């Protein structure tokens, strides 16, 4: 699995001036084991349509 | 019937017993006796000096006892033999003790607690090690010699006509074995020459404590007029139980008390829960279970819904664990000694703990409950020996799909990230690189300094530990690349462990950390320690914010134990609340890298992702993370501590070769012989052949630690956060396995302690058993260990942070030491020290202790503290002068001073102590004194102290001595980084400005700030303070000979200052009949003098009145990082008094910046000062600690409701003036309530006669204007208050 480029959410201009994304809190999270299993379930549902 | 005459007679007889033939007189305020010492005489004689009569001055003095020196008699301190007049009682406890003696052949050197080892007349090498151990672990310290306590015990036993068992065994010992040891009065830690056993001082301390408790319980029993204490419907005797405990614990005191302190607490917690009718006290507060707005209606009895549940297996095993624990301790005690006794009463009472009802409203049960928790106070400070053990990684629990370890790590990492975001939300952030070189002083109070530094003073070299000196000397080397890239895992670099004692348990180990590790930790962890200090959060499980969940820091914020912990009473009073308390075992041990450390490191690592653009002298933040924590830095580190030694024969050392005899660098104890390695120690160690001890010295036995350390900068936060993760897992598992049975209403995390307020929806035994089994199964699989014997799950009883509540009432436990102390202390200020002990005694008596015995103890302590500690000064013809002459004819003499006990009841400022005879919570002051003498009812109380005033000499106080006689040679090399740009600006000039830097700022001036800061840092160090203490004797002589017997009671004050004597300008009337309905209160275990106050005036039900102007100044000053530990409001006002208030904001900003206050605090303080100067009166209120004790915090006094109800005053007064009135009003109403006077409203009256009004106007005008000083400061009179005072009272 490949994560998106981190520069999509934030861009730096000067030493202390950086943009903030609307979903910084969600992007700062890390999945647990059950959430990883649920993501695998979601993808497995995606590859087999019906 | 007055206490003032009984205590005077008591202490008089104690004094005559201690010094036979004393000339002590009650009507004189002081007495002076001489003492002769020959120790200096011998050492002078070995230089060949010639003296007159040597032992004659002994023999003529001890026998004839009538020789005088300058008319002042000379006496000798009374012998050990006659302390109890030689009576005997053949107590069984004495043979119990002597049966417990042990010869040296049974030595176990690694013992945590010393056994009763015998002392032989001859010497052996192992006895040297035994002496070395005993000198350290058997110190008593304290503040009063034990012999004075024994004399007091004997005299009070004679007074009350009762014979404590402790005095019995004392007399039985002294009747045959004479002295136990010798103790010096100038330094009480000089205990030496053990006579019979190495454990005698423990015997004396425990016996005195037992006698004190026996006296206290009898007098408290007489106060309530009860015939016996009650358990259920059965009568019980407290002194019988105490003697029953004492006889059993005597074989091996410390070990038995430590192993036995837990079942007694469990019995108190478990008493009466299962009774069919339950008596509860109503309490009501907010919806949240931690609301602090409780109020109490009345008592009620109700049926118990939980009665059928107590047939559970869980409660049966909880009881059975404690029966095994009591029985094994009894067996061990019987086996060590030669006795077959047991604890019959306690095992009889333990059999039916559940069904016997508890009666909070009957004192016969409350006294018993309070006494059982206070029994354990007889083995204080519990000094012990500790061993160095490595991490033993093999027993660590590996994560597998059967445990929850990885889930714990993941959740704790998520919690670090969330808490970091929350801290960022509250404008708390990590330190900026501009603040790198100034924030290093902001370490937490649990931190410790690794390397001690060396200072040259002018001449002498000294060592110091405190952060200030070490940083000011070598702070620039902390961040240097040489010190960063080194690891403490070899012989050349290592760190040592320290130890500190605790009042009951075993000695606690602490870790010392080098600053190069602490500073990178601080850089990240500072904002979270700052953020978690706030209080008042919401603790519901469904609330998103985790800030309010952590109770660390949410303790003693109000300052009263009863007030801040009211949620315990509220939850115990509620029949619908089920409380659960999990007690872990070896928590700090089980914080592994598999479950705790790695997730924490990851939380910090992806925590600083938005800040990745910053740099610190080339290093980046994720490198600083490794600098703060890493292999060889915190984890996987070598640690040094106590040595490990082994048991061998003597001549086995003789067959050894020189390779095994090589002595290394590490020091070894006195009685142990060195040996090279631990391998040869294993080869040579023989168990049965005890002849000698050998200790390794090559460093092969240092401790290898890869576990969480108590000395780190984020220990409490990490611990509470880990407990939050554990509780989340517990809730998840109990919800999954048993849905709907248990619902969590509140979760509480503090330290390793966890608390839950929940609702239980079933009463079936099999469901409850499965729920408890699920909880224990989950906590077991989680990796920790939870003891089912200490874990508590009850409906009606609530405990947290050594605070207990049963059925809506407070059950206090008293652990305040009175005899011994944690460490040796030297009394720099006698008056403040006595103030401290009287304040602590207020807490003690508020926790259920007897008031009269407290008065007697303070009466004893007020006499002997100042004695024996003055030296090199002699008194002749009522004149003090230096020690004799160069003649060296009377060089062996010293003078001792005895103070009148009644000096305990003369106010501060009159060289005395501000205690009140009517009740200890009222503070004596001159106005209070004159009010008391004008009250007709108190005359019999006030009669003796009337003739004792104006006779008190000045008190010893080394603190006010401030001089420049401590010039240091070591300099402040890091000054170039500590000075603000405000300070740095004024030192690059060619002294042109130097001559215009003439502002009245005192020692905080450019060119001298560094020296003054260094000087203050040295005066923080006591080992540097000791140099200037030599010259204070001359100043004390000057204070003595400049004294005049005169009382001044100046009800005025310095015109800048206002005090509570101001209320004495007006007359005071008492009118109106207020409501006489008594109030309810949870603490039903008080002395009648305190009970009457708590009943006439209800508990406080609101916040105290708004903080003072000085309080606001101090709060503002608490914003500066570098000057908080150096600036008080007094320092600001002292500079202001010379600077003046008539300045603009820019002037004050510049002045504050020049005084090392950073510009933002300067601007804030300047603006606030300008606003106060323009708007209000701005005079600072001085209070004599009144309304500041433990008990007054819980009363409904010093509040707006109190003023609105009890007070009527003229409207012309100002806010500071009405506060000065209000404090006196609180004191007066408290005193009236204490004496049983009728409840009436109080008014301040101003009459219509012109002359009184003229004097009032004159006094107020002179008070609000500092006379000629108006020229000095150029204060504009156009301020509103002073301009308005033109026609206030015309």
TrEMBL record, chain A:
<protein>
    <submittedName>
        <fullName>VP3</fullName>
    </submittedName>
</protein>
Automatic annotation (TrEMBL), chain B:
<keyword id="KW-0808">Transferase</keyword>
<keyword id="KW-0693">Viral RNA replication</keyword>
<keyword id="KW-0696">RNA-directed RNA polymerase</keyword>
<keyword id="KW-0548">Nucleotidyltransferase</keyword>
<dbReference type="InterPro" id="IPR043502">
    <property type="entry name" value="DNA/RNA_pol_sf"/>
</dbReference>
<dbReference type="InterPro" id="IPR008723">
    <property type="entry name" value="RNA_pol_orbivir"/>
</dbReference>
<dbReference type="Pfam" id="PF05788">
    <property type="entry name" value="Orbi_VP1"/>
</dbReference>
<protein>
    <recommendedName>
        <fullName>RNA-directed RNA polymerase</fullName>
        <ecNumber>2.7.7.48</ecNumber>
    </recommendedName>
</protein>
<dbReference type="GO" id="GO:0003723">
    <property type="term" value="F:RNA binding"/>
</dbReference>
<dbReference type="InterPro" id="IPR007097">
    <property type="entry name" value="RNA-dir_pol_reovirus"/>
</dbReference>
<comment type="similarity">
    <text>Belongs to the reoviridae RNA-directed RNA polymerase family.</text>
</comment>
<dbReference type="GO" id="GO:0006351">
    <property type="term" value="P:DNA-templated transcription"/>
</dbReference>
<dbReference type="GO" id="GO:0000166">
    <property type="term" value="F:nucleotide binding"/>
</dbReference>
<dbReference type="GO" id="GO:0003968">
    <property type="term" value="F:RNA-directed RNA polymerase activity"/>
</dbReference>
<dbReference type="GO" id="GO:0019079">
    <property type="term" value="P:viral genome replication"/>
</dbReference>
<feature type="domain" description="RdRp catalytic">
    <location>
        <begin position="550"/>
        <end position="811"/>
    </location>
</feature>
<keyword id="KW-0547">Nucleotide-binding</keyword>
């Amino acid at each position: 699995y490949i994560a998106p480029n981190p520069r999509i959410s934030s861009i730096t201009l000067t030493q202390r001036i950086t943009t903030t994304g609307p979903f910084a809190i969600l992007t700062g999270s890390t999945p647990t084991a059950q959430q990883l299993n649920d993501v695998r379930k979601i993808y497995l549902a995606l590859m087999f349509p019906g | 019937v007055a206490i003032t005459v009984q205590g005077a007679q008591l202490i008089k007889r104690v004094v005559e017993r201690f010094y036979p033939g004393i000339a002590f007189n009650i009507n004189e305020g002081a007495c002076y006796i001489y003492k002769f010492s020959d120790h200096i005489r011998r050492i002078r004689m070995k230089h060949g000096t010639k003296y007159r009569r040597q032992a004659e001055e002994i023999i003529r003095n001890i026998s004839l006892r009538k020789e005088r020196l300058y008319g002042i008699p000379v006496l000798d301190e009374v012998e050990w033999k006659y302390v109890f007049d030689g009576q005997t009682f053949q107590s069984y406890a004495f043979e119990v003790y002597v049966n417990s003696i042990l010869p040296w052949s049974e030595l176990d050197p690694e013992e945590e607690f010393l056994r009763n080892y015998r002392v032989s007349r001859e010497m052996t090498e192992v006895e040297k090690f035994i002496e070395f151990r005993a000198k350290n672990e058997m110190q008593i310290y304290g503040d009063i010699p034990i012999k004075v306590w024994c004399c007091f015990i004997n005299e009070l036993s004679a007074e009350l006509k009762h014979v404590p068992l402790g005095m019995q065994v004392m007399a039985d010992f002294v009747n045959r074995f004479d002295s136990p040891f010798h103790q010096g009065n100038r330094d009480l830690s000089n205990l030496e020459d053990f006579q019979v056993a190495y454990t005698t001082p423990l015997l004396f301390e425990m016996c005195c404590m037992e006698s004190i408790l026996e006296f206290n319980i009898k007098m408290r029993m007489r106060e309530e007029e009860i015939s016996a204490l009650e358990f259920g419907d059965m009568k019980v005797d407290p002194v019988g139980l105490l003697r029953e405990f004492f006889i059993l614990c005597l074989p091996h005191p410390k070990k038995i008390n430590n192993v036995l302190r837990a079942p007694y607490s469990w019995f108190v917690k478990m008493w009466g829960v299962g009774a069919d009718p339950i008596v509860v006290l109503q309490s009501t507060a907010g919806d949240d279970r931690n609301s602090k707005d409780v109020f109490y209606d009345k008592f009620r009895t109700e049926p118990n819904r939980y009665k059928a549940l107590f047939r559970s297996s869980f409660y049966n095993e909880s009881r059975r664990m404690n029966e095994e624990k009591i029985l094994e301790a009894v067996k061990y005690s019987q086996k060590l000694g030669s006795h077959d006794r047991r604890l019959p009463l306690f095992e009889k009472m333990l059999k039916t703990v559940y069904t016997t009802p508890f009666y909070p409203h009957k004192s016969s049960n409350m006294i018993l409950a309070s006494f059982l928790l206070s029994i354990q106070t007889i083995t204080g400070y519990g000094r012990a020996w500790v061993k160095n053990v490595s991490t033993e990684f093999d027993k660590q629990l590996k994560p597998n799909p059967s445990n929850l370890v990885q889930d714990v790590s993941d959740l704790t990492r998520e919690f670090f990230k969330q808490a970091y975001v929350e801290a960022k939300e509250r404008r708390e952030e990590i330190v900026k690189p501009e603040d790198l070189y100034t924030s290093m002083l902001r370490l937490a109070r649990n931190t410790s300094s690794g390397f001690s530094t060396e200072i040259y003073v002018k001449l002498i070299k000294i060592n110091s530990r405190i952060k200030a000196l070490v940083i000011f000397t070598k702070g620039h080397t902390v961040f240097t690349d040489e010190e960063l890239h080194k690891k403490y895992n070899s012989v050349e670099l290592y760190q040592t462990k320290g130890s500190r004692d605790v009042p009951i348990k075993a000695t606690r180990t602490i870790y010392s950390i080098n600053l190069s590790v602490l500073v990178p930790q601080l850089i990240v962890t500072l904002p979270l320690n700052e953020y978690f200090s706030r209080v008042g959060g919401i603790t519901s499980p469904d609330y998103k914010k985790i800030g309010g969940k952590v109770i660390v820091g949410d303790l003693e914020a109000t300052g009263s134990r009863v007030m801040d912990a009211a949620d315990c009473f509220r939850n115990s009073a509620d029949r619908d609340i089920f409380t659960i308390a999990i007690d872990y075992s070896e928590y700090d041990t089980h914080l592994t890298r598999h479950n705790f450390r790695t997730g924490m490191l990851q939380g910090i690592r992806e925590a600083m992702a938005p800040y990745r653009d910053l740099r610190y002298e080339g290093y980046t933040l994720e490198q600083i993370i490794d600098f703060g924590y890493g292999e060889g830095r915190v984890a996987n580190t070598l640690w040094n501590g106590k040595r490990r030694l082994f048991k061998t024969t003597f001549d086995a050392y003789i067959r050894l070769d020189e390779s095994e005899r090589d002595k290394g660098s590490f020091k070894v104890p006195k009685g142990v012989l060195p040996v090279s390695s631990v391998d040869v120690a294993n080869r040579i160690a023989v168990d049965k052949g005890f002849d000698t001890l050998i200790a390794a010295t090559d460093g092969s036995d240092l401790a290898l630690i890869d576990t969480h350390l108590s000395g780190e900068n984020s220990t409490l936060i990490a611990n509470s956060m880990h407990n939050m993760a554990i509780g989340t897992l517990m809730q998840r598992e109990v919800g999954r396995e048993q849905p709907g049975v248990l619902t969590f209403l509140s979760e509480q995390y503090v330290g390793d302690d966890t608390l839950f307020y929940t609702k239980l929806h079933t009463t079936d035994t099999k469901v409850f058993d499965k729920v408890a089994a699920s909880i224990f199964d989950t906590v077991a699989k989680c990796g920790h260990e939870a003891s089912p014997s200490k874990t508590m799950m009850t409906p009606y009883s609530v405990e947290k942070t050594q605070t207990h509540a049963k059925q809506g009432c407070y059950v206090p436990q008293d652990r305040m030491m009175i005899i011994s102390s944690e460490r040796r202390k030297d009394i720099e200020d006698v008056q403040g020290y006595v103030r401290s002990q009287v304040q602590t005694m207020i807490t003690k008596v508020s926790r259920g202790f007897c008031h009269d015995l407290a008065q007697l103890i303070l009466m004893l302590k007020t006499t002997f503290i100042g004695a024996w500690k003055m030296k090199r000064t002699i008194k002749e013809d009522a004149m003090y002068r230096d020690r004799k002459f160069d003649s060296n004819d009377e060089d062996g003499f010293t003078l001792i001073q005895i103070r009148n006990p009644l000096a305990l009841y003369v106010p501060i400022g009159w060289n005395g102590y501000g205690a009140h005879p009517a009740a200890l919570n009222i503070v004596m002051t001159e106005e209070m004194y004159v009010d008391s003498i004008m009250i007709s009812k108190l005359d019999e109380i006030m009669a003796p102290i009337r003739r004792i005033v104006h006779d008190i000499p000045p008190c010893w106080n080394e603190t006010q001595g401030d001089k420049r006689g401590l010039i240091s040679a070591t300099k402040m090399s890091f000054f170039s980084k500590m000075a603000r740009p405000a300070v740095q600006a004024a030192l690059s000039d060619p002294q042109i400005i130097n001559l215009v830097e003439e502002l009245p700022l005192g020692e905080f001036s450019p060119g001298r700030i560094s020296r003054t800061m260094m000087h203050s840092a040295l005066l923080k160090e006591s080992s540097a303070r000791t140099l200037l203490s030599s010259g204070y004797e001359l100043e004390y002589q000057k204070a003595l000979n400049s004294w005049i017997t005169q009382v001044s009671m100046r009800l005025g004050e310095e015109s800048g200052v206002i005090s509570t004597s101001y209320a004495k300008l007006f007359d005071v009337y008492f009118e109106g009949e207020l409501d006489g309905a008594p109030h309810m209160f949870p603490d039903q275990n008080l002395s009648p003098q305190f009970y009457i106050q708590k009943m006439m005036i209800g508990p406080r039900v609101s916040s105290r009145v708004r903080n003072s102007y000085v309080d606001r100044i101090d709060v503002i000053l608490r914003k500066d990082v570098v000057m908080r530990g150096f600036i008080t409001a007094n320092t600001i006002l002292n500079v202001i008094e010379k600077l003046g208030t008539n300045h603009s904001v820019g002037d004050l900003v510049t002045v504050f910046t020049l005084m090392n206050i950073e510009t933002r605090v300067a601007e804030e303080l300047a603006e606030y000062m300008t606003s106060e100067k323009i708007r209000f009166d701005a005079l600072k209120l001085l209070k004599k600690g009144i309304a500041g004790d433990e008990f007054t915090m819980s009363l409904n006094v010093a509040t707006q409701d109190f003023i609105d109800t009890y007070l009527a005053y003229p409207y012309q007064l100002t806010k500071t003036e009405v506060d000065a009135i209000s404090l006196y009003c609180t004191q007066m109403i408290m005193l009236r309530a204490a004496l049983g006077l009728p409840k009436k409203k109080m008014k301040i009256v101003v009459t219509d006669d012109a002359k009184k009004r003229y004097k009032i106007r004159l006094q107020r005008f002179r008070t609000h204007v500092p006379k000629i000083k108006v020229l000095k400061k150029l204060i504009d009179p156009n301020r509103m208050t002073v301009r308005n005072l033109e026609n206030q009272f015309v």
